[PDB]
């Protein structure tokens with residue numbers, strides 16, 4: 527089991543960490559959503575589906591910078607929504623194919639009432655999402671840490 531990002535940066539068997547750069551809507555008003563869909567950014571595959579079943583959860587999701595201070599939101603994982611920052615580990619998603627499959631996680635963020643101006647700075651860390659991978663084969667328990675960075679400023683009209 528290993529993963530790779532849209533631009534090809536990968537985290538090998540055993541886990542590790544990688545940065546994911548995302549382009550964000552430049553203008554987001556209070557009452558509107560800023561959707562950060564990682565399903566088009568992070569992909570993983572099972573290296574031995576003939577024998578092993580891989581289990582993948584969103585172990586933890588944390589907010590940073592402009593997202594931590596100016597937005598409120600939830601994280602959608604494999605069809606279900608949870609609080610973000612996360613309060614617990616999500617249920618497992620099975621990976622049983624050698625073909626790359628998307629990691630079904632998306633952040634649904636919305637400006638807080640007092641949000642205004644540059645709510646998110648270009649190049650800043652907005653979130654850290656931890657993908658935890660285990661299996662039905664051995665004691666492997668690995669973390670694939672995804673550091674989500676904003677490619678541009680996000681402005682909230684005042």
Ligand SMILES: CCCCO[C@H]1O[C@H](CO)[C@@H](O)[C@H](O)[C@@H]1O
Nearest residue numbers: 527539540572573574578661666
């Ligand atoms: C006998 C071969 C083991 C290959 O081990 C690697 O691939 C499998 C299947 O994806 C993972 O469950 C495991 O944690 C490693 O990432």
